[PDB]
Write a protein that binds this ligand. Structure first.
Ligand SMILES: *[C@@H](O)[C@H](C[C@@H]1CCNC1=O)NC(=O)[C@H](CC(C)C)NC(=O)OCc1ccccc1
Length: 184
């Protein structure tokens, strides 16, 4: 087998064109660009009227904090950027279903955690979880000691973008599940 396996190669290829580092008033977050001018951040990143990407202020046209049908926070905020550059459309890589895997990779890219690729192993649906005081729905859980600064990180498996890191309790990490219908 190749030294660098399919999960890693997929993560790196996804990151190169669809992950940027965004700075809000709450600091730097890994940020997935989904299509056109649409990206996602952890809701607690609290994007304001603008964010910094690549040292430049980029206006935010809209920010939509996602909730499930019962009103429960999903901890995903969809933001729309005022700029002409379009993100490679990766919607086809986002599953229609909340998706588990035996082999997930957490992708983080900030000045604190530059080019971080971690195979977190099993990614399992958890559902409703109180994340340190923030009630959250549709979470995924992995057994890896994630830390502050990694939120916004992308969870992938080969061929799919399945979650966005939002929390952790010391020994485990938690992601907001991604579904294609969020972006269509
Ligand atoms: C990223 O901003 C950060 C990542 C956490 C920090 C510790 N390890 C991580 O992976 N997310 C949070 O700090 C987060 C923000 C909420 C408003 C969603 N809350 C959090 O992770 O609380 C800790 C906790 C999680 C689950 C059960 C009990 C406590």
């Amino acid at each position: 087998h190749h030294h660098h396996g399919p999960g890693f190669d997929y993560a790196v290829a996804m990151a190169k064109r669809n992950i940027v580092t965004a700075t809000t008033s709450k600091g730097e977050f890994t940020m997935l660009g989904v299509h056109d001018n649409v990206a996602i951040l952890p809701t607690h990143a609290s994007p304001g009227e603008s964010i910094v990407i690549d040292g430049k202020e980029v206006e935010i046209l809209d920010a939509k904090a996602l909730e499930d049908q019962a009103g429960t926070n999903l901890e995903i905020t969809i933001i729309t950027l005022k700029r002409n550059e379009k993100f490679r459309d990766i919607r086809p890589h986002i599953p229609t279903q909340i998706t588990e895997t035996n082999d997930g990779v957490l992708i983080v890219n900030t000045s604190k955690y530059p080019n971080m690729y971690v195979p977190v192993g099993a990614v399992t649906e958890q559902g409703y979880l109180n994340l340190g005081g923030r009630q959250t729905a549709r979470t995924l859980m992995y057994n890896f000691p994630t830390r502050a600064g990694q939120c916004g990180g992308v969870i992938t498996c080969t061929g799919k973008v399945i979650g966005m890191h939002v929390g952790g309790n010391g020994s485990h990490g938690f992601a907001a599940a991604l579904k294609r219908s969020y972006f269509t």
